[PDB]
Design a protein around this ligand. Structure first.
Ligand SMILES: [Cd+2]
Ligand SMILES: [Cd+2]
Ligand SMILES: [Cd+2]
Ligand SMILES: [Cd+2]
Length: 52
């Protein structure tokens, strides 16, 4: 899968063509990269990862 979402709960295959690199990690979206700053889950209808 190469780039595996840095989010511990959220497992999404990330593409190096278009990946949000934050703090050196590859996340499926910036929401996971920013550790859900505003409180939004990732743009994938598989899970509902968010901070709590
Ligand atoms: Cd997720
Ligand atoms: Cd994610
Ligand atoms: Cd997440
Ligand atoms: Cd995702």
């Amino acid at each position: 899968n190469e780039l595996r979402c840095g989010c511990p709960d959220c497992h999404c295959k990330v593409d190096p063509e278009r990946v949000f690199n934050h703090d050196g990690e590859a996340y499926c979206s910036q929401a996971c990269a920013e550790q859900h700053p505003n409180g939004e889950p990732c743009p994938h209808p598989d899970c509902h990862c968010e901070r709590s």
